[PDB]
Every structure is written in structure tokens, then in C-alpha cells.
Design an enzyme around this catalytic site. Sequence first.
Site, PDB file in Angstrom:
ATOM      1  N   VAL A  26       1.046  -1.302   0.115  1.00 33.03           N
ATOM      2  CA  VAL A  26      -0.014  -0.051   0.013  1.00 33.03           C
ATOM      3  C   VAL A  26       0.910   1.190   0.126  1.00 33.03           C
ATOM      4  CG1 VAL A  26      -1.959   1.258   1.185  1.00 33.03           C
ATOM      5  CG2 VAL A  26      -1.687  -1.366   1.328  1.00 33.03           C
ATOM      6  N   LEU A  94      -7.394   7.438   1.761  1.00 29.74           N
ATOM      7  CA  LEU A  94      -6.342   7.463   2.669  1.00 29.74           C
ATOM      8  C   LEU A  94      -6.602   7.923   3.999  1.00 29.74           C
ATOM      9  CD1 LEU A  94      -3.106   7.779   2.826  1.00 29.74           C
ATOM     10  CD2 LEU A  94      -3.344  10.192   2.202  1.00 29.74           C
ATOM     11  N   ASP A 137     -11.277 -10.146   9.801  1.00 28.78           N
ATOM     12  CA  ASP A 137      -9.949  -9.766  10.136  1.00 28.78           C
ATOM     13  C   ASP A 137      -9.759  -8.464  11.135  1.00 28.78           C
ATOM     14  OD1 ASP A 137      -7.323 -10.363   9.960  1.00 28.78           O
ATOM     15  OD2 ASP A 137      -6.767  -9.602   8.054  1.00 28.78           O
ATOM     16  N   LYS A 139      -8.543  -6.459  13.993  1.00 29.64           N
ATOM     17  CA  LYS A 139      -7.471  -6.432  14.880  1.00 29.64           C
ATOM     18  C   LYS A 139      -6.985  -4.945  14.695  1.00 29.64           C
ATOM     19  CE  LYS A 139      -4.580  -8.588  11.237  1.00 29.64           C
ATOM     20  NZ  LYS A 139      -3.325  -9.414  11.094  1.00 29.64           N
ATOM     21  N   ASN A 142      -5.775  -3.236  11.670  1.00 31.14           N
ATOM     22  CA  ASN A 142      -6.698  -3.334  10.765  1.00 31.14           C
ATOM     23  C   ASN A 142      -7.781  -1.954  11.166  1.00 31.14           C
ATOM     24  OD1 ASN A 142      -5.696  -4.669   8.848  1.00 31.14           O
ATOM     25  ND2 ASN A 142      -6.886  -6.452   9.423  1.00 31.14           N
ATOM     26  N   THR A 178      -5.583 -14.059  12.120  1.00 33.38           N
ATOM     27  CA  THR A 178      -4.342 -14.134  12.944  1.00 33.38           C
ATOM     28  C   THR A 178      -4.879 -14.721  14.184  1.00 33.38           C
ATOM     29  OG1 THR A 178      -3.757 -11.987  12.024  1.00 33.38           O
ATOM     30  CG2 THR A 178      -2.969 -12.547  14.127  1.00 33.38           C
TER      31      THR A 178
HETATM   32  N1  LIG Z   1      -6.417   3.276   3.144  1.00 35.33           N
HETATM   33  C1  LIG Z   1      -5.269   3.288   3.798  1.00 35.33           C
HETATM   34  N2  LIG Z   1      -4.434   4.363   4.323  1.00 35.33           N
HETATM   35  C2  LIG Z   1      -3.437   4.083   5.029  1.00 35.33           C
HETATM   36  N3  LIG Z   1      -2.893   2.934   5.230  1.00 35.33           N
HETATM   37  C3  LIG Z   1      -3.378   1.800   4.864  1.00 35.33           C
HETATM   38  C4  LIG Z   1      -4.805   1.742   4.186  1.00 35.33           C
HETATM   39  N4  LIG Z   1      -5.019   0.517   3.941  1.00 35.33           N
HETATM   40  C5  LIG Z   1      -3.891  -0.165   4.344  1.00 35.33           C
HETATM   41  N5  LIG Z   1      -3.037   0.676   4.854  1.00 35.33           N
HETATM   42  C6  LIG Z   1      -1.691   0.019   5.585  1.00 35.33           C
HETATM   43  O1  LIG Z   1      -1.160  -0.986   4.566  1.00 35.33           O
HETATM   44  C7  LIG Z   1      -1.170  -2.357   5.509  1.00 35.33           C
HETATM   45  C8  LIG Z   1      -1.676  -3.302   4.799  1.00 35.33           C
HETATM   46  O2  LIG Z   1      -2.931  -3.080   4.054  1.00 35.33           O
HETATM   47  P1  LIG Z   1      -4.237  -4.260   4.070  1.00 35.33           P
HETATM   48  O3  LIG Z   1      -5.163  -3.702   3.529  1.00 35.33           O
HETATM   49  O4  LIG Z   1      -4.260  -4.673   5.614  1.00 35.33           O
HETATM   50  O5  LIG Z   1      -3.467  -5.502   3.112  1.00 35.33           O
HETATM   51  P2  LIG Z   1      -3.370  -7.160   3.525  1.00 35.33           P
HETATM   52  O6  LIG Z   1      -3.930  -7.284   4.918  1.00 35.33           O
HETATM   53  O7  LIG Z   1      -4.270  -7.888   2.397  1.00 35.33           O
HETATM   54  O8  LIG Z   1      -1.864  -7.443   3.361  1.00 35.33           O
HETATM   55  C9  LIG Z   1      -2.377  -1.885   6.669  1.00 35.33           C
HETATM   56  O9  LIG Z   1      -1.992  -2.612   7.803  1.00 35.33           O
HETATM   57  C10 LIG Z   1      -1.867  -0.249   6.746  1.00 35.33           C
HETATM   58  O10 LIG Z   1      -0.937   0.013   7.658  1.00 35.33           O
HETATM   59 MG   LIG Z   2      -3.641  -5.799   7.577  1.00 33.81          MG
END
Ligand SMILES: Nc1ncnc2c1ncn2[C@@H]1O[C@H](COP(=O)(O)OP(=O)(O)O)[C@@H](O)[C@H]1O
Ligand SMILES: [Mg+2]
Length: 279
Positions: A26, A94, A137, A139, A142, A178
Site C-alpha cells: 500500500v 487515505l 480480520d 484487529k 486493521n 490472525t
Molecule cells: N486506506 C489506507 N490508508 C493508509 N494506510 C493503509 C490503508 N490501507 C492499508 N493501509 C496500510 O497498509 C497495511 C496493509 O494493508 P491491508 O489492507 O491490511 O492488506 P493485506 O492485509 O491484504 O496485506 C495496513 O495494515 C496499513 O498499515
Molecule cells: Mg492488514
Amino acid sequence: TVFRQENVDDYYDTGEELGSGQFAVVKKCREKSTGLQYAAKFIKKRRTKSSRRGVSREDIEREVSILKEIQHPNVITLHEVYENKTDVILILELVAGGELFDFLAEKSLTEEEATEFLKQILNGVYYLHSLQIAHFDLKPENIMLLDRNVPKPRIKIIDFGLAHKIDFGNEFKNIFGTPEFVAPEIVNYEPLGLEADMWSIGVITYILLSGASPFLGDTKQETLANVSAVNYEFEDEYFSNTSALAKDFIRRLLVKDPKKRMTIQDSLQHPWIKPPQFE
Ligand SMILES: Nc1ncnc2c1ncn2[C@@H]1O[C@H](COP(=O)(O)OP(=O)(O)O)[C@@H](O)[C@H]1O
Ligand SMILES: [Mg+2]
């Protein structure tokens, strides 16, 4: 369904990495046409059938279908979707204030600071469950804050990679998150429904109040065993000056039988509130 197959870089400029998953990265980004900022989530696609790397198209489509339905102050919204041969790229709202996880690492919390966060989480989950969406999910990593540096931060629930629509009250198989946060029915590979989220909320509440994880063992398998056995207790050292009603709220969520666990509607009326598995 297919997505926009133009080069995402033609429309967005990318910046800092915001976070990382096993199959997702991300990055902050900025839309050229509006100058608005987003988080671009790059999800690696499967390269074959039966490949273990990447996410299956069916799983990516489900995450996108769910995100498109969402619009609520406490959940993330989806702005646009692009794709190419390697990735699907979700342009998400964001959230710039970091994970609740890292906020908790900084700061213990007072009961009121804990309920300030929890009321918003419950409002977001009430919305999702009203839609029959189980997040699966939940936690502290998230949950995100819009701004860390305010006395009562606002939060948004993120990461719909395991979310499912539950249209029969349960779904069969079996979206393992998790170990510390998963309900016994996930551990035991039983049919799953909206109640699994409520268990996770109880785990999150325990941690918000104490800074300790209720079921955490020294290995993933030991945590899973603790969860199935409902092996937790309120340590005096952490909880001796926490209110009995706060403990009552947690006790009614950390219940093995999902039929007997508080619902999201119950949790909002509760007196305290009412105004990666294998090693
Ligand atoms: N909309 C967002 N804005 C800012 N940071 C984000 C956002 N979405 C995800 N992140 C960051 O990226 C990490 C991974 O994203 P995630 O959606 O949890 O993907 P996955 O769990 O499938 O790898 C998050 O734990 C967070 O730190
Ligand atoms: Mg995550």
C-alpha cells in the site's frame, strides 16, 4: 468483472509506502486530475491456477464487490480500481494517522479513551453487519486513525481481504485470520457468521484496556489452543482498577458458542456502552 486497464501511473503519482501485506503493498498516491490523495493497494494476482503466491481472482473480486457497497464514516471507501497482468490496484480512501496498533505501542489507555475508540469500531461494525458483511480480520492493525495528534482520534476500519457477505446466517469455509484474534469457530473450522467479528471485538477491547493479549501463547498453535478452550482471565495487575462493567462487556463477547455471544446490536445497548495460522 474486469477493471480499468490503463497504466495507473498515467493518472496517479505514487509516494511513501504506507503498509505491507503478504500479497499487498500500500502506497500513498495523488490523483493528477484533482490533486486529492489516496492509498493505492497493489494486490499480486495468481500467476497460475493452483499457485500459492498471489490472490485468486475470485478472492480479489469479492474484496472489490464488498468495498464498492461501503459508505460510512468509520469504514474505508473505494475510489477506483485498476488492473494489469501482475496486480489489481485498489485506490482507497487515505487514512493518514497510522494504525491503532502503532498508536497503542506509543501511548496504557483510560476506560474513556478505550470506549471512545470502541464506540466508533462498534458503529462501523454495526454498519457492516447491517449489510450482512462479516469483516473476519478485525484487529488493531486493521483499524486506522484519521489523525493521531488529536485528543479523541477518529477511526476507520480497513482491510476487506477476508470479508464475506453472509446471506444464510453462516458461510462454510473458512477464512482464517490472525490466531490471537480469531474466534473458536474459526479455530475449529466450523461454519462462520457475523458473530466471529464480535469475538474479535472482545479481544480488541481486552487489549485496549490492558495492553496485553488474552489468548496469546508462545507459538501460533498454542494461541489457537487457548482460543478454542477460552483460556483467558483478567489479570489483577492489569485490571484491578478497571470497572466491573468493562469486564462484563468483554465476558459477554469472549463466549465459545456464537449463538450465546453478544450481537453488534446487544453490544451497543450494553450498559458500559449505551449513553497466518501455521508456524
Ligand atoms: N486506506 C489506507 N490508508 C493508509 N494506510 C493503509 C490503508 N490501507 C492499508 N493501509 C496500510 O497498509 C497495511 C496493509 O494493508 P491491508 O489492507 O491490511 O492488506 P493485506 O492485509 O491484504 O496485506 C495496513 O495494515 C496499513 O498499515
Ligand atoms: Mg492488514
